[PDB]
Design an enzyme around this catalytic site. Structure first.
Site, short mmCIF file in Angstrom:
data_model
loop_
_atom_site.label_atom_id
_atom_site.label_comp_id
_atom_site.label_asym_id
_atom_site.label_seq_id
_atom_site.Cartn_x
_atom_site.Cartn_y
_atom_site.Cartn_z
N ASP A 192 0.81 -1.21 0.00
CA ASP A 192 0.00 0.00 0.00
C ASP A 192 0.85 1.26 0.00
N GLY A 193 1.99 1.23 0.69
CA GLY A 193 2.90 2.37 0.63
C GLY A 193 3.40 2.65 -0.78
N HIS A 228 1.40 9.49 3.24
CA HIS A 228 2.71 9.25 3.82
C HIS A 228 3.57 10.51 3.94
N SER A 283 -11.83 4.86 1.61
CA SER A 283 -10.83 3.79 1.56
C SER A 283 -9.70 3.99 2.58
N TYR A 314 -5.15 4.46 9.27
CA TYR A 314 -5.02 5.17 10.55
C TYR A 314 -6.37 5.37 11.25
N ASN A 315 -7.38 5.76 10.49
CA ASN A 315 -8.73 5.93 11.03
C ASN A 315 -9.16 4.72 11.85
N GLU A 358 -5.65 9.66 4.22
CA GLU A 358 -6.13 10.61 5.23
C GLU A 358 -5.18 11.79 5.32
N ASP A 411 -3.75 15.26 21.20
CA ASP A 411 -2.62 14.97 20.32
C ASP A 411 -2.88 15.41 18.88
N1 LIG Z 1 -1.54 18.86 26.84
C1 LIG Z 1 -0.22 18.94 26.35
N2 LIG Z 1 0.14 18.75 25.07
N3 LIG Z 1 0.75 19.26 27.36
C2 LIG Z 1 0.40 19.88 28.64
C3 LIG Z 1 1.63 20.16 29.49
C4 LIG Z 1 1.47 20.21 31.01
N4 LIG Z 1 0.98 18.97 31.62
C5 LIG Z 1 0.81 19.19 33.06
C6 LIG Z 1 -0.32 18.45 33.64
C7 LIG Z 1 -1.22 17.80 34.08
C8 LIG Z 1 -2.19 16.96 34.66
N5 LIG Z 1 -1.91 15.99 35.50
C9 LIG Z 1 -3.15 15.42 35.79
C10 LIG Z 1 -3.50 14.28 36.53
N6 LIG Z 1 -2.62 13.54 37.21
N7 LIG Z 1 -4.80 13.92 36.55
C11 LIG Z 1 -5.68 14.67 35.88
N8 LIG Z 1 -5.47 15.77 35.15
C12 LIG Z 1 -4.17 16.08 35.13
N9 LIG Z 1 -3.56 17.07 34.38
C13 LIG Z 1 -4.23 17.90 33.40
O1 LIG Z 1 -3.83 17.58 32.07
C14 LIG Z 1 -4.33 18.66 31.24
C15 LIG Z 1 -3.37 18.95 30.10
O2 LIG Z 1 -2.08 19.32 30.56
C16 LIG Z 1 -4.63 19.84 32.19
O3 LIG Z 1 -6.03 19.85 32.40
C17 LIG Z 1 -4.02 19.39 33.52
O4 LIG Z 1 -4.83 19.84 34.61
C18 LIG Z 1 1.74 17.76 31.26
C19 LIG Z 1 0.85 16.52 31.26
O5 LIG Z 1 -0.09 16.62 30.17
C20 LIG Z 1 -0.68 15.35 29.99
N10 LIG Z 1 -1.03 15.20 28.59
C21 LIG Z 1 -0.22 15.38 27.50
N11 LIG Z 1 -0.81 15.15 26.35
C22 LIG Z 1 -2.10 14.77 26.71
C23 LIG Z 1 -3.20 14.32 25.96
N12 LIG Z 1 -3.20 14.17 24.62
N13 LIG Z 1 -4.31 13.97 26.64
C24 LIG Z 1 -4.31 14.06 27.97
N14 LIG Z 1 -3.34 14.48 28.78
C25 LIG Z 1 -2.25 14.81 28.09
C26 LIG Z 1 0.33 14.31 30.49
O6 LIG Z 1 -0.32 13.49 31.46
C27 LIG Z 1 1.49 15.15 31.05
O7 LIG Z 1 1.99 14.56 32.25
N1 LIG Z 2 3.04 3.21 10.26
C1 LIG Z 2 3.78 4.41 10.11
N2 LIG Z 2 4.27 5.14 11.12
N3 LIG Z 2 3.94 4.81 8.74
C2 LIG Z 2 3.80 3.88 7.62
C3 LIG Z 2 4.10 4.56 6.28
C4 LIG Z 2 3.46 4.00 5.02
N4 LIG Z 2 1.98 4.02 5.02
C5 LIG Z 2 1.50 3.39 3.79
C6 LIG Z 2 0.25 2.63 3.96
C7 LIG Z 2 -0.79 2.07 4.13
C8 LIG Z 2 -2.07 1.50 4.25
N5 LIG Z 2 -3.14 1.98 3.67
C9 LIG Z 2 -4.16 1.13 4.09
C10 LIG Z 2 -5.55 1.18 3.89
N6 LIG Z 2 -6.16 2.09 3.12
N7 LIG Z 2 -6.31 0.26 4.52
C11 LIG Z 2 -5.70 -0.66 5.27
N8 LIG Z 2 -4.40 -0.81 5.53
C12 LIG Z 2 -3.68 0.13 4.91
N9 LIG Z 2 -2.33 0.38 5.04
C13 LIG Z 2 -1.45 -0.32 5.96
O1 LIG Z 2 -1.01 0.51 7.03
C14 LIG Z 2 0.07 -0.20 7.67
C15 LIG Z 2 1.12 0.77 8.18
O2 LIG Z 2 1.68 1.56 7.14
C16 LIG Z 2 0.56 -1.26 6.67
O3 LIG Z 2 0.00 -2.49 7.07
C17 LIG Z 2 -0.17 -0.89 5.38
O4 LIG Z 2 -0.53 -2.06 4.65
C18 LIG Z 2 1.38 5.33 5.33
C19 LIG Z 2 0.04 5.16 6.04
O5 LIG Z 2 0.26 4.61 7.35
C20 LIG Z 2 -0.93 4.77 8.09
N10 LIG Z 2 -0.59 4.92 9.50
C21 LIG Z 2 0.30 5.80 10.05
N11 LIG Z 2 0.38 5.72 11.36
C22 LIG Z 2 -0.53 4.72 11.69
C23 LIG Z 2 -0.96 4.20 12.92
N12 LIG Z 2 -0.52 4.63 14.12
N13 LIG Z 2 -1.92 3.26 12.89
C24 LIG Z 2 -2.41 2.87 11.71
N14 LIG Z 2 -2.07 3.27 10.49
C25 LIG Z 2 -1.12 4.21 10.55
C26 LIG Z 2 -1.68 5.98 7.51
O6 LIG Z 2 -2.99 5.56 7.15
C27 LIG Z 2 -0.81 6.41 6.31
O7 LIG Z 2 -1.64 6.80 5.22
#
Ligand SMILES: N=C(N)NCCCN(CC#Cc1nc2c(N)ncnc2n1[C@@H]1O[C@H](CO)[C@@H](O)[C@H]1O)C[C@H]1O[C@@H](n2cnc3c(N)ncnc32)[C@H](O)[C@@H]1O
Ligand SMILES: N=C(N)NCCCN(CC#Cc1nc2c(N)ncnc2n1[C@@H]1O[C@H](CO)[C@@H](O)[C@H]1O)C[C@H]1O[C@@H](n2cnc3c(N)ncnc32)[C@H](O)[C@@H]1O
Ligand SMILES: N=C(N)NCCCN(CC#Cc1nc2c(N)ncnc2n1[C@@H]1O[C@H](CO)[C@@H](O)[C@H]1O)C[C@H]1O[C@@H](n2cnc3c(N)ncnc32)[C@H](O)[C@@H]1O
Ligand SMILES: N=C(N)NCCCN(CC#Cc1nc2c(N)ncnc2n1[C@@H]1O[C@H](CO)[C@@H](O)[C@H]1O)C[C@H]1O[C@@H](n2cnc3c(N)ncnc32)[C@H](O)[C@@H]1O
EC number: 2.7.1.23
Lengths: 261, 261, 261, 261
Positions: free
Chosen positions: A45-46, A220, A155, A160-161, A120, A147
């Protein structure tokens, strides 16, 4: 017609390409990688995603075919032993074309860039915390903290979806689907949680709240974008065309890749 | 035209019905609950689902309107204070009709019964372990072991489907979506996991493996079915028609119900 | 005793720090930020996480207290209006200490570095595809393909772990919990899917398969590590100590942050 | 010592039981199914769960062993070809005992009934909508609306708990874990969503809000309870004891059942 063949570039795929080229030479087939009408991709697929992007400016003049030299692909869904039967059926033509929807991504600065995705497009922050306002048809829907976000073609829903909890969507449906990557949800922060499926002509826009630098991926390809004001997703008016020679239904392709084969 | 009004049957809803009836009497409006052309439902989504099923045999001759006397409904999306403005705009007519897809369920014995769902249809076992073979367009897709399966309309995607991990789907998309209820997945037992979205004219069939007794629900109605050979789901050719007097977009309705209002 | 006070550094938090310092001057309290026995953090959870890491080499000699000047924190769980009552109850002492588990992370090169986390440690790839072999107590458990892995303390389970689908764990349980970030799962690629909860003295090791560069985060700190041979997680023998003056149970703290307050 | 052997009751399992009985007759082993000290279960996990419940009033005097005549079980983790080596090693004794936590369920009417679970206990409504107030250590945590709740032992975490999104927990951890079954979550209805892991001596109580009839399951046993005032869960003070003759670690058992074997 004019055709070309991309290879993953390992020995298996190169040699299968050389043999198909040889078989094509026994027909009114001309190898042209500038304006092909048939693009054969050998690899996985890549490799197929690369071939789509190599020729994305001639999507409407091209039919694509994938040969999987490793495991079955969703796009590369012919086996290597079928290659000679493929050469034959395709020199004659008289094949059906099947069309799948694509996703248009528009990125606006403070200037515009457009991209087409077959799998995607995703947005993640460039180091800091990702916060974006999500606006659907100019209506502010939610403030997303987490994140990142993933916008998938039909398709792409098995790529990833799928790993993000999204639904698998039959490719005859003209839609795009948005999934969350690790959203924060507490008293002060709320996202929908569920994947969202949008029809044609709906526009989903992501607008920055503080940090304006994002890592945007398209299939990709992954580009760090600076001074971004907006990312706009909609179902493309363009479609990718496959050449089909046999019935291989999508749900069977899904069963074969995920349930067992 | 001919109209009728259902009420949830608490004091608030009954009295709002009596007042709207009185307001209708000042126009060329005749209360007829046998062959209405306008069905107003006062209450919540459960009241609206009842009204749909009361009149499911005259879907094409009827436009529906929901008034929420409690919280906002997805179907019952007018407020009680707007009721007098509703009476007026609707005696004149000149309103737009909006149509949403429905789900057809067919249950076959060893004889057939058909049902229409506005939210979803679900199958669960009648006491024992639920095991069904899942067949898509006559292709055996998977053997499902677990609590049950849920097949949702687009407007049902925010109901049970949502709590099961399904995607929210815009109601302009003619599709149905299947979600799992607690599937078993180990070395010997495999399901897809992901929700599945099917287009029009795809047929999803559930066939028993041992136990042939199932609890089948259709919206709020839940029937124990015995000697069941098959359950067939497809997007219905019939649609439910809403009377609209203002723009209230689906995604805004979603934002209002789940993000905040 | 010796104490110190960190501030988030906005006007609210600085001025509350200045007032508490003034109130402490009316007792046998000496401000010392080199060898404090009491560390007060004013701000949010991010401010509290900074204070933990500022003093991670004197965890056993220090009791921590968090004051939330914004919303309620999980760590910063006193209100600003209680600050004067806090000064008083704490100059006397006679407070209970409460201890929470920490996570030890060891990173080995081709050399070792150790880190302590109060929330979690995560590993993501440095640009390419993330593939790691996951080994539990020297037993090869799975080959993980996807975005990354998250290893959480009990009190971190409400942070990133929660957004990844992890379970919330009461902090009296000496354990760590591993969650997946977007794993690939198909015919050829299998992960467990479920979060995993490990007791004390279990060692979870991540070993590279091809790419050996990873982005490793520890709480808020995120370091690009090169030439990595192994990442080892275990429940730390060290604990963080809180000073408590009132009953504020963990599940109530959870209800207050996520259900409503 | 005194021993007994349960069989799944198909031909394979009956005949393996007859052969082990014969092999035991060549030692100082007496078949007694009233007061055994060794209980061997031949069949699968369902057969093992039956054997636990047959002898739940003599848990402390009994060591259990499972033989899987079908696929590998989590409890029934010896193969049929090892049976003669099992007879021998066990007539001598000198085996280690391993102990796993159990879940105590108390059901109160308007009277009390207690049950012990090795896998889990679940509550679902008896026809209507399931609404229960969830109280942790007398603190009202949440109002749960949905299909039901599941409370799991550590060794049950790979059973129903797993299919509901729960974490897998090492059985040395004395805890119980609560998962949701299809919760409703919108503007007016909020649950935590995440699984919850509780330590020993925490009490989780479910109290009815309107309907007071519930279907309560304990492992494989499912009882309709009427006039229920409360359902109380806590980690039991009783434990189940396994006889072990070899190292077969839990995470390896998990790898073997779910990743591949
Ligand atoms: N969000 C980003 N990109 N970076 C944020 C930097 C600062 N963070 C300090 C904290 C905290 C925290 N600890 C707890 C706890 N113990 N219990 C319940 N709330 C809690 N917070 C709350 O988390 C929220 C977001 O921060 C605030 O509301 C804070 O009240 C660092 C911390 O983020 C956390 N983090 C990073 N990425 C994600 C993510 N995608 N989803 C969820 N959490 C994420 C990670 O677990 C790290 O340690
Ligand atoms: N994995 C990383 N970090 N990068 C990989 C680079 C190359 N990729 C080409 C492809 C594909 C693909 N299309 C489909 C499709 N249409 N249907 C079902 N299989 C499918 N593949 C399969 O996906 C697997 C992994 O690749 C292989 O098996 C391949 O058979 C790029 C594509 O990765 C996908 N990708 C990126 N990160 C993630 C992730 N965390 N989880 C799931 N997919 C991820 C994204 O959707 C991108 O487009
Ligand atoms: N499936 C229905 N309707 N009823 C089945 C009745 C008999 N069950 C015996 C068992 C077991 C078991 N314990 C474990 C364990 N400790 N670890 C890992 N495997 C385990 N099994 C495996 O579970 C599978 C199914 O049974 C078999 O493979 C067996 O190997 C009763 C038990 O089912 C469980 N159960 C009930 N409904 C569901 C469901 N929807 N999803 C997942 N499990 C479910 C529940 O946890 C109960 O106790
Ligand atoms: N909850 C039990 N046991 N039975 C309730 C009986 C009455 N229901 C009427 C409705 C509705 C409805 N349609 C939508 C819609 N289209 N969009 C968004 N909200 C919607 N509601 C809201 O659903 C909530 C609950 O009802 C209310 O708030 C109502 O506002 C029948 C309907 O329940 C649904 N249902 C049943 N069980 C569950 C469950 N476990 N989780 C989630 N929904 C469930 C199912 O989808 C059925 O049709």
């Amino acid at each position: 017609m004019k055709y070309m063949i991309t290879s993953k570039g390992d020995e298996k795929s190169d040699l299968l390409r050389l043999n198909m080229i040889a078989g094509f030479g026994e027909y009114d087939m001309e190898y042209d990688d500038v304006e092909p009408e048939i693009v054969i991709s050998i690899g996985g697929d890549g490799t197929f995603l690369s071939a789509f992007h190599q020729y994305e400016e001639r999507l409407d003049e091209i039919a694509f075919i994938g040969i999987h030299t490793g495991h079955l692909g969703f796009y590369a869904d012919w086996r290597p032993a079928e290659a000679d039967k493929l050469v034959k059926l395709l020199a004659k033509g008289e094949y059906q074309k099947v069309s799948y929807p694509l996703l248009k991504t528009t990125v606006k600065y403070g200037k515009e860039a457009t991209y087409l995705a077959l799998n995607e497009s995703t947005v993640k922050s460039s180091g800091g915390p990702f916060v974006v306002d999500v606006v659907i048809n100019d209506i502010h829907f939610e403030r997303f903290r987490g994140d990142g976000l993933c916008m998938s073609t039909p398709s792409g829903t098995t790529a990833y979806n799928k790993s993000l909890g999204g639904a698998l969507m039959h490719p005859s449906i003209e839609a795009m689907q948005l999934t969350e990557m690790a959203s924060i949800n507490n008293r002060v922060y709320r996202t929908i949680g569920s994947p969202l499926v949008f029809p044609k002509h709906h526009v989903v826009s992501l607008q920055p709240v503080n940090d304006k630098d994002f890592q945007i991926s398209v299939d990709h390809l992954s580009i760090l974008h600076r001074d971004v004001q907006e990312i706009r997703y909609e179902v493309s008016a363009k479609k990718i065309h496959f050449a089909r020679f046999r019935s291989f239904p999508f749900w069977r392709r899904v069963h074969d890749s995920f349930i067992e084969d």
